[PDB]
Write a protein that binds this ligand. Sequence first.
Ligand SMILES: [Zn+2]
Ligand SMILES: [Zn+2]
Ligand SMILES: [Zn+2]
Length: 570
Amino acid sequence: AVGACVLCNSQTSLRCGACIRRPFLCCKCCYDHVISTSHKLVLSVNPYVCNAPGCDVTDVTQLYLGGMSYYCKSHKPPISFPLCANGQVFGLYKVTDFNAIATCDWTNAGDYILANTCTERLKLFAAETLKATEETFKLSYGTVREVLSDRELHLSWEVGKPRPPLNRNYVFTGYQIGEYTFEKDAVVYRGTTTYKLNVGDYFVLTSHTVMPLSAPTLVPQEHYVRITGLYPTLNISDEFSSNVANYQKVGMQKYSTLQGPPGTGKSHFAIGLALYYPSARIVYTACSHAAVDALCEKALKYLPIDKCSRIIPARARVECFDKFKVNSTLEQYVFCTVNALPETTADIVVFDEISMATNYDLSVVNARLRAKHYVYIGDPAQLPAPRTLLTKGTLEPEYFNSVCRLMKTIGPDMFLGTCRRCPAEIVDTVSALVYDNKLKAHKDKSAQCFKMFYKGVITHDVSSAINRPQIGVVREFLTRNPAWRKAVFISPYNSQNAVASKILGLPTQTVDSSQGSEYDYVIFTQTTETAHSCNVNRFNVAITRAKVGILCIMSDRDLYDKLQFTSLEI
Ligand SMILES: [Zn+2]
Ligand SMILES: [Zn+2]
Ligand SMILES: [Zn+2]
């Protein structure tokens, strides 16, 4: 029960029993915390409480030290001194920001802003407090009535508690018969495992214990004068020649940031780093299984298949890359999600899709992976990890995580400025929208990029929006543009996606789940004109999925006018 103060590192024996993480606080800092918040319980070898029989006084400001025990004003002996005096709480070895992180409920965007602009140690405490606050709430949200078929169900809920939204962010566990997701009387049930399940089975949200954090989100930066710990090859392929200047900067710094807009070659950069440093052992990590899978696919073409291994938790979350040797931690090239990372060492660590990472994830990576060099690849102009507790305000990219903050304040170390995937109409649009006209297009205009302003009629299934007339507009477009039936339908709402799947028969994806993918033809309906559907990062992701053509049914005049597409009438 002896440690370092979370604000001043000054050693102390006092903890705050009211904070959910019970951090160590120094005599001065613990004082400033109890007099400015409702947190009044102080812990030590023994709890600072009145030891008189039947007394419930726990406020440290109402407690004194008499003998070797603690008492209140009504039980203290004549010879006693106050625990709280001289700007200090009594302990061994005898701020405004810390109070806010410790007492907020993480429902306002200002809470996440403070968690990214504070000192480095407060970032660790905030990430701990946030994840702990997120987990407790899970134990509280609100049974199959009848099985109709092999993919839909009728559900009945528990009495007295609200219903959690039915999407992919909320994964239920049925009863360890596997993890399930639901989507919206009829509801679609999708269990990762095909276990049998009759009427009466109940499902509960899967909770994962929050472990305390110790490693920082970012290691201390170190700049070198020569390539350290690595041996660069001289005969690099001409496919990776343009990255040699930035490849050398990787070996001369502890960490490096790379902002890669869509289609600029992020995975091409990451895989070629292994060819430029052929003797290095590399762990490729990311938050999602799809991001690590994309890095596996690029590796299969360029890296020896016998030196690659994909780490899969027996948790069998989803089907992952099955073309590398499974669960071989000691291989040269290791592909693994952050949550499943083993405790090992590496020459370089590549963290992909950095905008989807939380400050918790940055800490787990540093705690499990000791490496000579870390490279963070991503794009703060794309989508972040969902903060389910955040309901008031929008989280700006500078407050996504420590890495995204640096990319937006001082800029990224390296930048990929040429998009090779999208037609010029899409590139010019997003370049002016979120990239300061610094993103150039390798392709010409395709003349297959169209936009249409059509508000339609907005209906809602609970909280997910639907715009059937916008789908009807798409229907009429398909009958007149037959080559587009191979397109992918994208929208910001799962429900609009479910309706479009039945009416149009196209493959469907949400904008958030389409990040990292690319398709020849994309059809996008904005559905609504909300802050969710008008988010510039979401929109940037949505329209940069197309390789050849895109059709945008717009609800927002601003974003409609900013689209440099040909307008179609109907
Ligand atoms: Zn506290
Ligand atoms: Zn302190
Ligand atoms: Zn008492």
